[PDB]
């Protein structure tokens, strides 16, 4: 089998994607933000405290003639961005872009955190990272691609982010007209349960490259590019008024500037970021501050290749017995 779905930013400045996804019997759609980096399904639902649900739609297990409630269980997350949710479990039917798994574990939110309520687009998450991070108790659960793999044609998903325009999650191919050139793989470890991998350097604009290593995880749930502080210097330093801004929480440019690209390593492959795409817009409505898409790392204890990097690439996620990625010029 195989499954196929649109993705599409939810706001003007590419903040995090949304795809949609039928749960239960008749199916309900609810549009995820498909996370690479944790491993919990999780949804708005009938359970949500009403005072934290503001314009999401909302999952209701008592509709769904598929859903049972997974006895006992309970989940609870927190987020490196410091939102959380927590719930129960049911067990229902979910599909995504065709591809259809029974018996998958859908986690009601009881409670989410203020910026969940915030976020209007967001019906949940759907985690891709691996099933040895999700949070359900007593008993793990496994991601929606743990559940399909065995089924899948090849036991890969793929994730082509689009720059201010709809792309494309696809689950079980590899679509040869998506990308150009050819796929680097690289090693990918599991250890921490993350898609971690290390890239081979970096360059900023039309400077040289720097071979170097930085291990870092294949974040789609994670909006920017958060790397070491030495690299994000290097990067800031190209572009007249850049400073990092403590009160702010990062690097700001003159909304005016031209942004340098910047390019990172895969193997002896090269993946460029456009400038454009390095450019999140004022700090607040009017500003001619503007917030960098490049930030350090150094406050986080990892390497996050967030949506800016991934959007410039056709990104595979191969889930074979010993995993890999794949990036591709696209």
Known sequence: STGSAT??????????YITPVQIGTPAQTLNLDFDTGSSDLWVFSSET???????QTIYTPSK???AKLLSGATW????????????????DTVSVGGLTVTGQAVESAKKVSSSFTEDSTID??????????????PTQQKTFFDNAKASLDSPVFT?????????????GFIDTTAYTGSITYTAVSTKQGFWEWTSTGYAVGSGTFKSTSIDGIADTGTTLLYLPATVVSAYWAQ??????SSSVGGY????????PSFTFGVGSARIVIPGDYIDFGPISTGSSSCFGGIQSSAGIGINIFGDVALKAAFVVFNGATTPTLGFASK
């Open 7 to 16: 993705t599409t930013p939810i706001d003007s400045l590419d903040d995090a």
């Open 49 to 55: 405290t009403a005072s934290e649900v503001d314009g």
């Open 64 to 66: 769904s003639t598929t």
């Open 76 to 91: 609870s997350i927190s987020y490196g961005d410091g939102s959380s949710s927590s719930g129960d479990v049911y067990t």
């Open 124 to 137: 949940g998450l759907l985690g891709l990272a691996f099933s040895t991070l999700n949070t359900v108790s």
């Open 159 to 171: 994730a082509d982010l689009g720059y201010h325009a709809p792309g494309t999650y696809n689950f």
């Open 239 to 244: 572009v007249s008024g850049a400073k990092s």
């Open 252 to 259: 700001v440019f003159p909304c005016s500037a031209t942004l």
